[PDB]
Design an enzyme around this catalytic site. Structure first.
Site, PDB file in Angstrom:
ATOM      1  N   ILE A  10       0.757  -1.417   0.649  1.00  0.00           N
ATOM      2  CA  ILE A  10      -0.640  -0.446   0.199  1.00  0.00           C
ATOM      3  C   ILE A  10       1.069   1.230   0.019  1.00  0.00           C
ATOM      4  O   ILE A  10       0.420   2.350  -0.695  1.00  0.00           O
ATOM      5  CB  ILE A  10      -0.948  -0.126   0.999  1.00  0.00           C
ATOM      6  CG1 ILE A  10      -1.550  -0.825   0.453  1.00  0.00           C
ATOM      7  CG2 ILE A  10      -1.516   1.450   1.133  1.00  0.00           C
ATOM      8  CD1 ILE A  10      -2.916  -1.289   2.237  1.00  0.00           C
ATOM      9  N   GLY A  11       1.969   0.879   0.233  1.00  0.00           N
ATOM     10  CA  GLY A  11       3.350   1.994   0.815  1.00  0.00           C
ATOM     11  C   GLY A  11       3.886   1.830   1.974  1.00  0.00           C
ATOM     12  O   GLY A  11       3.994   1.080   2.228  1.00  0.00           O
ATOM     13  N   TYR A  15       6.155   5.453  10.363  1.00  0.00           N
ATOM     14  CA  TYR A  15       6.461   4.101  10.870  1.00  0.00           C
ATOM     15  C   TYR A  15       7.433   3.081  10.082  1.00  0.00           C
ATOM     16  O   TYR A  15       8.604   2.111  10.732  1.00  0.00           O
ATOM     17  CB  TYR A  15       5.735   3.466  11.770  1.00  0.00           C
ATOM     18  CG  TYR A  15       5.349   4.675  12.921  1.00  0.00           C
ATOM     19  CD1 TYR A  15       6.424   5.241  13.578  1.00  0.00           C
ATOM     20  CD2 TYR A  15       3.655   4.881  12.716  1.00  0.00           C
ATOM     21  CE1 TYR A  15       5.727   6.738  13.871  1.00  0.00           C
ATOM     22  CE2 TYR A  15       3.716   5.664  13.136  1.00  0.00           C
ATOM     23  CZ  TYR A  15       3.987   7.104  14.287  1.00  0.00           C
ATOM     24  OH  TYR A  15       3.673   7.410  14.963  1.00  0.00           O
ATOM     25  N   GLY A  16       7.142   2.400   9.261  1.00  0.00           N
ATOM     26  CA  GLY A  16       7.034   1.353   8.078  1.00  0.00           C
ATOM     27  C   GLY A  16       6.065   0.904   6.887  1.00  0.00           C
ATOM     28  O   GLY A  16       5.349   2.263   6.959  1.00  0.00           O
ATOM     29  N   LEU A  79      -9.804  -0.101   4.006  1.00  0.00           N
ATOM     30  CA  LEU A  79     -10.653   1.386   3.309  1.00  0.00           C
ATOM     31  C   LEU A  79      -9.684   1.455   1.920  1.00  0.00           C
ATOM     32  O   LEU A  79      -8.267   0.614   1.995  1.00  0.00           O
ATOM     33  CB  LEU A  79     -11.094   2.331   3.832  1.00  0.00           C
ATOM     34  CG  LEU A  79     -11.360   2.454   4.758  1.00  0.00           C
ATOM     35  CD1 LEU A  79     -10.786   2.459   6.363  1.00  0.00           C
ATOM     36  CD2 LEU A  79     -12.478   3.526   5.130  1.00  0.00           C
ATOM     37  N   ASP A 123      -0.742  14.646  13.996  1.00  0.00           N
ATOM     38  CA  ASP A 123      -0.361  14.379  12.868  1.00  0.00           C
ATOM     39  C   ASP A 123      -0.940  13.757  12.146  1.00  0.00           C
ATOM     40  O   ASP A 123      -0.980  13.316  10.985  1.00  0.00           O
ATOM     41  CB  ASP A 123       0.872  12.400  12.733  1.00  0.00           C
ATOM     42  CG  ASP A 123       1.499  13.339  11.485  1.00  0.00           C
ATOM     43  OD1 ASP A 123       1.955  14.671  10.802  1.00  0.00           O
ATOM     44  OD2 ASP A 123       2.312  11.890  11.033  1.00  0.00           O
ATOM     45  N   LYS A 125      -3.221  14.644   7.923  1.00  0.00           N
ATOM     46  CA  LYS A 125      -3.040  14.787   6.706  1.00  0.00           C
ATOM     47  C   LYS A 125      -4.085  14.217   6.166  1.00  0.00           C
ATOM     48  O   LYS A 125      -4.165  13.091   5.890  1.00  0.00           O
ATOM     49  CB  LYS A 125      -1.369  14.431   6.109  1.00  0.00           C
ATOM     50  CG  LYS A 125      -0.810  13.042   7.006  1.00  0.00           C
ATOM     51  CD  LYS A 125       0.318  13.003   6.590  1.00  0.00           C
ATOM     52  CE  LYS A 125       1.313  12.027   7.754  1.00  0.00           C
ATOM     53  NZ  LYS A 125       2.667  11.912   7.501  1.00  0.00           N
ATOM     54  N   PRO A 126      -4.296  14.437   4.295  1.00  0.00           N
ATOM     55  CA  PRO A 126      -4.675  13.377   3.762  1.00  0.00           C
ATOM     56  C   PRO A 126      -4.761  12.201   3.628  1.00  0.00           C
ATOM     57  O   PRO A 126      -5.752  11.761   2.919  1.00  0.00           O
ATOM     58  CB  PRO A 126      -4.504  14.808   2.306  1.00  0.00           C
ATOM     59  CG  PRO A 126      -4.668  15.614   2.964  1.00  0.00           C
ATOM     60  CD  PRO A 126      -2.906  15.660   4.220  1.00  0.00           C
ATOM     61  N   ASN A 128      -3.767  10.486   5.685  1.00  0.00           N
ATOM     62  CA  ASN A 128      -3.834   9.450   6.608  1.00  0.00           C
ATOM     63  C   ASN A 128      -5.839   9.105   6.766  1.00  0.00           C
ATOM     64  O   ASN A 128      -6.219   9.068   7.929  1.00  0.00           O
ATOM     65  CB  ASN A 128      -3.610  10.556   8.030  1.00  0.00           C
ATOM     66  CG  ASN A 128      -2.702  10.389   8.728  1.00  0.00           C
ATOM     67  OD1 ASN A 128      -2.410  10.942   9.361  1.00  0.00           O
ATOM     68  ND2 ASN A 128      -2.172   9.019   8.578  1.00  0.00           N
TER      69      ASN A 128
HETATM   70  N1  LIG Z   1      -5.670   1.069   6.488  1.00  0.00           N
HETATM   71  C1  LIG Z   1      -6.123   1.141   5.212  1.00  0.00           C
HETATM   72  O1  LIG Z   1      -6.256   0.988   4.782  1.00  0.00           O
HETATM   73  C2  LIG Z   1      -4.680   2.036   4.564  1.00  0.00           C
HETATM   74  C3  LIG Z   1      -4.097   1.979   5.687  1.00  0.00           C
HETATM   75  C4  LIG Z   1      -2.549   2.916   5.118  1.00  0.00           C
HETATM   76  N2  LIG Z   1      -1.545   3.444   5.671  1.00  0.00           N
HETATM   77  O2  LIG Z   1      -1.077   2.561   7.119  1.00  0.00           O
HETATM   78  O3  LIG Z   1      -0.805   3.561   5.204  1.00  0.00           O
HETATM   79  C5  LIG Z   1      -2.638   3.681   4.048  1.00  0.00           C
HETATM   80  N3  LIG Z   1      -1.988   4.749   3.525  1.00  0.00           N
HETATM   81  C6  LIG Z   1      -1.677   5.659   2.763  1.00  0.00           C
HETATM   82  C7  LIG Z   1      -0.484   5.860   1.923  1.00  0.00           C
HETATM   83  C8  LIG Z   1       0.253   6.986   2.204  1.00  0.00           C
HETATM   84  C9  LIG Z   1       0.782   7.344   1.368  1.00  0.00           C
HETATM   85  O4  LIG Z   1       2.163   7.222   0.836  1.00  0.00           O
HETATM   86  O5  LIG Z   1       0.927   8.220   0.140  1.00  0.00           O
HETATM   87  C10 LIG Z   1      -3.613   3.574   2.995  1.00  0.00           C
HETATM   88  C11 LIG Z   1      -4.903   2.530   3.367  1.00  0.00           C
HETATM   89  N4  LIG Z   1      -5.701   2.925   2.641  1.00  0.00           N
HETATM   90  C12 LIG Z   1      -5.744   3.022   1.090  1.00  0.00           C
HETATM   91  C13 LIG Z   1      -5.420   3.016   0.144  1.00  0.00           C
HETATM   92  C14 LIG Z   1      -4.309   3.901  -0.738  1.00  0.00           C
HETATM   93  C15 LIG Z   1      -4.175   3.351  -1.316  1.00  0.00           C
HETATM   94  C16 LIG Z   1      -3.520   2.282  -2.058  1.00  0.00           C
HETATM   95  N5  LIG Z   1      -4.541   0.928  -1.141  1.00  0.00           N
HETATM   96  C17 LIG Z   1      -5.567   1.710  -0.234  1.00  0.00           C
END
Ligand SMILES: NC(=O)c1cc([N+](=O)[O-])c(NCCCC(=O)O)cc1NCc1cccnc1
EC number: 2.7.11.22
Length: 294
Positions: A10-11, A15-16, A79, A123, A125-126, A128
């Site tokens: 996902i990214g 933290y990790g 989500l 913290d 942010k969009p 989150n």
């Molecule tokens: N709990 C979750 O479902 C979730 C958790 C985290 N995260 O625990 O970080 C996350 N990163 C946010 C991404 C931060 C970034 O690198 O911009 C995105 C999530 N879902 C939305 C999603 C978005 C894209 C692809 N697939 C699902």
């Protein structure tokens, strides 16, 4: 992952690494976060564990805190998309006002809930803020900052964004209040409306000065006690405050009024989530469905 088949990356979180995964036993699809050095602070364990009871429809549910093999994994409800990606995708036409209002209303309900239980995010942010096809939006990572801290750089050397940081934090205050979250949400609300970040600083001082250039350099009149803050300097340039009509056009007066209260300098004057929910801006709130192409 023993009990989890990794579906996708996902990214790279603060933290990790975060993976979308499937529980091999239940089949439930979740978000699995592998948190970063040696021993795992026991205090963080108890604190993070308490968050398993902080359940609300606008808070991403913490399903489990796995402390095994002396490594820390957090399992969260999944989500499909985050608000940053949604805003980028909506950049050309902008998110319709009814949806911006619905999201802000839901986010405030989430903050009202956590805040009443004495839990802060710190913290926001969009990235989150997570959304689904039903028109719901939820806050992710509430309470983690307290369990850990500000890394400056995620874990892959990525720069932690300062764009949504409250000014009391930038000025060195050691004790955060629930007001820091209202500030961040105000910044996000403005970004949804204008389609450009409100205060995109690229250093702590650039972030503070961008805030001062827009809202005016704070003084003892608008913020009693500001000149005694740890990082306050009498040498800060003195900028005049700009009118909101110029800051978030073409938002209406109900929206500008609410935003102005969410961005008050004095943390004690800043509107609470509960009070914000009663603001006239939400008189005609509805729950539209977003156009989500997953
Ligand atoms: N709990 C979750 O479902 C979730 C958790 C985290 N995260 O625990 O970080 C996350 N990163 C946010 C991404 C931060 C970034 O690198 O911009 C995105 C999530 N879902 C939305 C999603 C978005 C894209 C692809 N697939 C699902």
């Amino acid at each position: 992952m023993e009990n989890f088949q990794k579906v996708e990356k996902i990214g790279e979180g603060t933290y990790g690494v975060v993976y979308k995964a499937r529980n091999k036993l239940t089949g439930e699809v979740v978000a699995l976060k592998k948190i970063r050095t040696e021993g795992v602070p026991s205090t963080a364990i108890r604190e993070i564990s308490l968050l398993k009871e902080l359940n609300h429809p606008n808070i991403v549910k913490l399903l489990d805190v796995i402390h095994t093999e002396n490594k820390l994994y957090l399992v969260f409800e999944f989500l499909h998309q985050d608000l940053k990606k949604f805003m980028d995708a909506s950049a050309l036409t902008g998110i319709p006002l009814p949806l911006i209002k619905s999201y802000l209303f839901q986010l405030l309900q989430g903050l009202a809930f956590c805040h009443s239980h004495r839990v802060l995010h710190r913290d926001l942010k969009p990235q989150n803020l997570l959304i689904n096809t039903e028109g719901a939006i939820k806050l992710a990572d509430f309470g983690l900052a307290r369990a850990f801290g500000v890394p400056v750089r995620t874990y892959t050397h990525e720069v932690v964004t300062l764009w949504y940081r409250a000014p009391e934090i930038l000025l060195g205050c050691k004790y955060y209040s629930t007001a820091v979250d209202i500030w961040s949400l105000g910044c996000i609300f403005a970004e949804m409306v204008t389609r450009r970040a409100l205060f995109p600083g690229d250093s702590e001082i650039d972030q503070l000065f961008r805030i001062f250039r827009t809202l005016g350099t704070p003084d003892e009149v608008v913020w009693p006690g500001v000149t005694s803050m740890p990082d306050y300097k009498p040498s800060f340039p003195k900028w005049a405050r700009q009118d909101f009509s110029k800051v978030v056009p073409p938002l209406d007066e109900d929206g500008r009024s609410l935003l102005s209260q969410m961005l008050h300098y004095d943390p004690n004057k800043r509107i609470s989530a509960k009070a914000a929910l009663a603001h006239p801006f939400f008189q005609d709130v509805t729950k539209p469905v977003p156009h989500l192409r997953l």
